[PDB]
């Protein structure tokens, strides 16, 4: 055939892929973390937005640190051969490099490692997108007038 460049990911597989949305609104009292009001608005907006992009959306609510890890592990073990990509959205409290389950923290690295090129072969060479709505610290941007 003609010149082939391969500058963009192949996104015409039978399926666009999964869009896992983890929406944590209510946290265990012992954690002392406040409920994240308005997060359901985000969860619904995302479900609809990615639905229109043809992603197989799966919404999960108020997951403990254990359930988050179990979910990601199970999802990474699925056969993504016929899927073009993978998307995971995390909505929760957090700190730098951390996302909070309802009962404690989860290192983001632990979550993403399940999808490493050598650990999830059916996603090797395919885009793995992690969208993170959570604090990365306590600094505040005072901004500057334009």
């Amino acid at each position: 055939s003609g010149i082939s460049l391969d500058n963009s990911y192949k996104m015409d597989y039978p399926e666009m892929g999964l869009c896992i949305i983890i929406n944590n609104k209510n946290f265990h009292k012992s954690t002392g973390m406040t409920s994240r009001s308005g997060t359901d608005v985000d969860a619904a907006n995302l479900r609809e937005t990615f639905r229109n992009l043809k992603y197989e959306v799966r919404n999960k609510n108020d997951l403990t640190r254990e359930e988050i890890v179990e979910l990601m592990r199970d999802v990474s073990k699925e056969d993504h051969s016929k899927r073009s990509s993978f998307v995971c959205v995390l909505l929760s409290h957090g700190e730098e490099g951390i996302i909070f389950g309802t009962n404690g923290p989860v290192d983001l690295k632990k979550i993403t490692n399940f999808f490493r090129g050598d650990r999830c072969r059916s996603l090797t060479g395919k885009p793995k997108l992690f969208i993170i709505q959570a604090c990365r610290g306590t600094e505040l941007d005072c901004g500057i007038e334009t």
């Binding site: 992009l53 957090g94 990365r136 600094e139 505040l140 901004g143």
Partner: protein, 93 residues
Amino acid sequence: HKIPVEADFLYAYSTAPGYYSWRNSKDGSWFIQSLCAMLKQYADKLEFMHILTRVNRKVATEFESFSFDATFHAKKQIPCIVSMLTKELYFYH
């Protein structure tokens, strides 16, 4: 031939390293509101990094906190795009 095990990952953070991330109890987080709006409007037209760039500008210019607590009043936010992607990404084909 091998590729890095960390290749082909894109992290779309709502805020810069070390900063708080803002959320409106009624409209949702600034980042997610903006992300969905830009995807709805440009997913069938722009490459993903360019879409995320519009999200950065939208969040940076259209949002500012209001608080009775001077410490958290009139603050801004800039999302943070972290790409380890090796190719351009279009949601359409």
